[PDB]
Ligand binder design. Structure first.
Ligand SMILES: *[C@@H]1O[C@H](CO)[C@@H](O[C@@H]2O[C@H](CO)[C@@H](O)[C@H](O)[C@H]2NC(C)=O)[C@H](O)[C@H]1NC(C)=O
Ligand SMILES: *[C@@H]1O[C@H](CO)[C@@H](O[C@@H]2O[C@H](CO)[C@@H](O)[C@H](O)[C@H]2NC(C)=O)[C@H](O)[C@H]1NC(C)=O
Ligand SMILES: *[C@@H]1O[C@H](CO)[C@@H](O[C@@H]2O[C@H](CO)[C@@H](O)[C@H](O)[C@H]2NC(C)=O)[C@H](O)[C@H]1NC(C)=O
Ligand SMILES: *[C@@H]1O[C@H](CO)[C@@H](O[C@@H]2O[C@H](CO)[C@@H](O)[C@H](O)[C@H]2NC(C)=O)[C@H](O)[C@H]1NC(C)=O
Ligand SMILES: *[C@@H]1O[C@H](CO)[C@@H](O[C@@H]2O[C@H](CO)[C@@H](O)[C@H](O)[C@H]2NC(C)=O)[C@H](O)[C@H]1NC(C)=O
Ligand SMILES: *[C@@H]1O[C@H](CO)[C@@H](O)[C@H](O)[C@H]1NC(C)=O
Ligand SMILES: *[C@@H]1O[C@H](CO)[C@@H](O)[C@H](O)[C@H]1NC(C)=O
Ligand SMILES: *[C@@H]1O[C@H](CO)[C@@H](O)[C@H](O)[C@H]1NC(C)=O
Ligand SMILES: *[C@@H]1O[C@H](CO)[C@@H](O)[C@H](O)[C@H]1NC(C)=O
Ligand SMILES: *[C@@H]1O[C@H](CO)[C@@H](O)[C@H](O)[C@H]1NC(C)=O
Ligand SMILES: *[C@@H]1O[C@H](CO)[C@@H](O)[C@H](O)[C@H]1NC(C)=O
Lengths: 289, 120, 36, 49, 49, 49, 49
């Protein structure tokens, strides 16, 4: 139950420094006043984010740091999958006052999928067809999220933080806690955000990012809450902190690593050509027998 | 004769029947090309450790990078940084030479050492 | 070289020669009093 | 091929460890000699023994 | 390993054997520098005849 | 969490999502019972020559 | 399981042997330092050197 639309709200992607956001608890083990050096898929420090403002389709790749700013519970829906149709199993997430709503199966998404709100709200017309499936699950302000999918496990972390500055991302640190886990795996390649309500919304600023494998250095406090993190492969200073496993470094000289000049091309040779076979007489004989 | 390195111009002499020389412990050191019958030589392309000279995390957060025992011709994020300097110890990137004389704070090597004022 | 490297000594031979020359001139002119 | 590389790694690790141990022993000997030399410099050069 | 990937992966699971080797060699080098400095740098100024 | 030792009462506080703590070198030092959800402790029963 | 346990035993034996050797070297150096300290106590404290 959906139609097309006219006002293509296409806006160019602005850019802004990512700063030091996107740190989550990797393991559910308690630790106290230690610096456990770990490597994992993170959001590298000091990148820039594909800021958006109809809503485009984006690739999944490894992961996504889908942050979002909002006032009074704006963003609701999420669509994930490979082909985003009834041919391949798709995934749908709806967040609301309670924790999480999850449906996992093939749907029929049109060019204008939106949940719709009625003004006491009751409307559901994102797709049209739902053939069969098994798993469903039930349970000013910046709402940070993370969407990982590793070895048949889908993981969602979260955090909520009040903000006061209008535009830029905060210059602060806040770790992410594990919220939802699913023992289901699909080769997801794309995802899309859902639109709320014809629709009338242009001020929906949701940032996007990407995760890469690298190594960090987390610091746990006495209560086991991550309060600091140091990237390793960023600059010739953080490498010293990584290799010393300390946050303060004394005056001196420390050996970090070593480099090697890499090969460029190949010049494979062979002995100079000599002693051509006498095929000229055979192929240009006066008379064949 | 598989191998990696750089092929400069050699000035040795082969008797008319050899094909390639070597020096000690079975390491190739010269090859005569199979086509023009001239002798080149092989030198493996350089490697080496790196080191970081920092004046103290509390005092500052800018560092100088030392590439040990490497010619300052093919160094390459600190590809340029500050004024690149060459010394017997290696290529020093991020500090500028000073033609005065002080005491020694952080022994660098080969008769030179650095300190904090920038980094000299 | 096969991954093994030799690092230069911190003091060059010229500075060592300078140390020895200073020591020897001091003991020629001052005696042992310059050690205290 | 993994097993063959295991053999090579074990042999080369053994050789490297032996080399390091010999280096440590000879370094201890050289340090004893250097301490003796420092004592001789402090006692015979800077004064009459 | 000598510029190979499989060898590096195989050696990785052997624990941390390289770190203490490099630590020992670095200690040796620092000891050499300390030996030379303490043997020769017995004086403060630089005299001239 | 297979392991031996004595289980005592502790005062360490776990955030609502951890299960078991550790101190250093991957050694379990605490655990939350999966039924009453309290912070126990672990100490291997003593040995000695 | 015999082969796997043999690998574990060999690795741990190697590590333990290296640890013991390092302990022996450090003990020798410390004993040299202790002899020096005893000499200093017996020569400077109990009389004018
Ligand atoms: C229900 O839909 C699912 C999704 O297409 C179908 O299940 C697939 O069945 C094939 C054949 O056994 C498996 O290889 C796939 O892994 C299954 N996928 C999923 C997501 O279950 C199934 O055929 C459909 N019909 C029924 C009755 O289950
Ligand atoms: C770690 O959590 C504990 C558990 O509450 C905190 O302990 C008390 O917390 C209250 C609430 O702020 C304080 O009024 C008490 O003074 C705390 N007592 C002690 C002995 O700490 C503790 O404050 C937390 N640690 C940090 C750094 O926030
Ligand atoms: C391979 O051998 C051929 C024939 O012996 C060489 O060809 C001659 O090379 C000389 C030197 O450059 C020239 O002056 C002649 O004009 C060439 N003649 C012919 C028919 O090619 C050839 O040079 C050798 N290969 C290389 C790389 O030198
Ligand atoms: C670093 O490499 C350059 C060349 O890549 C060396 O410069 C050469 O020096 C020799 C001897 O002085 C000259 O015959 C060449 O003509 C120079 N080549 C160039 C391109 O300038 C330089 O000497 C090397 N550095 C060191 C310390 O050896
Ligand atoms: C665990 O199941 C048992 C089954 O009764 C309950 O545990 C305790 O039950 C007694 C009643 O016999 C209560 O007085 C206690 O308060 C219960 N303890 C706790 C920690 O709840 C209870 O239903 C279950 N406990 C849970 C889920 O925490
Ligand atoms: C980051 O910023 C640079 C320059 O500001 C810009 O050219 C680039 O498109 C931005 N995004 C990425 C992913 O580099
Ligand atoms: C939120 O979703 C949950 C799960 O579907 C549901 O039980 C709850 O009533 C919903 N609340 C609101 C306010 O929509
Ligand atoms: C993911 O791709 C692999 C390719 O080998 C395939 O075997 C698997 O069934 C795919 N899984 C899904 C959920 O499409
Ligand atoms: C045979 O002669 C023709 C005529 O010139 C020529 O094109 C061809 O290359 C010759 N082939 C051989 C094998 O001699
Ligand atoms: C560290 O640096 C700060 C500022 O330069 C200085 O105030 C402080 O005394 C320094 N600490 C030490 C231990 O040198
Ligand atoms: C090096 O010494 C020369 C004198 O020959 C002087 O002109 C130059 O300024 C000195 N270099 C620096 C960096 O001061």
């Amino acid at each position: 139950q959906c139609v097309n639309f006219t006002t293509r709200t296409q806006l160019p992607p602005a850019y802004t420094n990512s700063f030091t956001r996107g740190v989550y608890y990797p393991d559910k083990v308690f630790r106290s006043s230690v610096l456990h050096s770990t490597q994992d898929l993170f959001l590298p420090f000091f990148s820039n984010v594909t800021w958006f403002h109809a809503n485009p389709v984006l690739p999944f790749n490894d992961g996504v740091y889908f942050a979002s700013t909002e006032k009074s519970n704006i963003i609701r829906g999420w669509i994930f999958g490979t082909t985003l149709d009834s041919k391949t199993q798709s995934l749908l997430i709806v967040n609301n006052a309670t924790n999480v709503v999850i449906k996992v199966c093939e749907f029929q998404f049109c060019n204008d999928p939106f949940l719709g709100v009625y003004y006491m709200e009751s409307e559901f017309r994102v797709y049209s067809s739902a053939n069969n499936c098994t798993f469903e699950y039930v349970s000013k302000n910046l709402r940070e999220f993370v969407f990982k999918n590793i070895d048949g496990y889908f993981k969602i972390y979260s955090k909520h933080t009040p903000i006061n500055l209008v535009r830029g991302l905060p210059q602060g640190f806040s770790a992410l806690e594990p919220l939802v886990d699913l023992p289901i795996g699909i080769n997801i390649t794309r995802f899309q955000t859902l639109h709320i309500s014809g629709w009338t919304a242009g001020a929906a600023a949701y940032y996007v990012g990407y995760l890469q494998p690298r190594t960090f250095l987390l610091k746990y406090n006495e209560n086991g809450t991550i309060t600091d993190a140091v990237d390793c492969a960023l600059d010739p200073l953080s490498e010293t902190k990584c290799t010393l496993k300390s946050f303060t470094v004394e005056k001196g000289i420390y050996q970090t690593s070593n480099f090697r000049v890499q090969p460029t091309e190949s010049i494979v040779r062979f002995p100079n050509i000599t002693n051509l076979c006498p095929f000229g007489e055979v192929f240009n004989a006066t008379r064949f027998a | 004769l598989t191998g990696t390195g750089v092929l400069t111009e050699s000035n040795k002499k082969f008797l008319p029947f050899q094909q390639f020389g070597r020096d000690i412990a079975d390491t190739t050191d010269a090859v005569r090309d199979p086509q023009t019958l001239e002798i080149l030589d092989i030198t493996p392309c350089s490697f080496g450790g790196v080191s970081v000279i920092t004046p103290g995390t509390n005092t500052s957060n800018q560092v100088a990078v030392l590439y040990q025992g490497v010619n300052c011709t093919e160094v390459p994020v600190y590809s340029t940084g500050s004024n690149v300097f060459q010394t017997r110890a290696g290529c020093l990137i991020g500090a500028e030479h000073v033609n005065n004389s002080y005491e020694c704070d952080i022994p660098i090597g080969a008769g030179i050492c650095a300190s904090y004022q920038s980094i000299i | 070289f096969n991954g093994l490297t030799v690092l230069p000594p911190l003091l060059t031979d010229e500075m060592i020669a300078q140390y020895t020359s200073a020591l020897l001139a001091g003991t020629i002119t001052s005696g042992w009093t310059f050690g205290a | 091929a993994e097993v063959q590389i295991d053999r090579l790694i074990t042999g080369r690790l053994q050789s490297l460890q032996t080399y390091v141990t010999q280096q440590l022993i000879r370094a201890a000997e050289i340090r004893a000699s250097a301490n003796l030399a420092a004592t001789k410099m402090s006692e015979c050069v800077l004064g009459q023994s | 390993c000598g510029d190979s990937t499989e060898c590096s992966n195989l050696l990785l699971q052997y624990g941390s054997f390289c770190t203490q080797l490099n630590r020992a060699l670095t200690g040796i080098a620092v000891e050499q520098d300390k030996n030379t400095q303490e043997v020769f740098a017995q004086v403060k100024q630089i005299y001239k005849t």
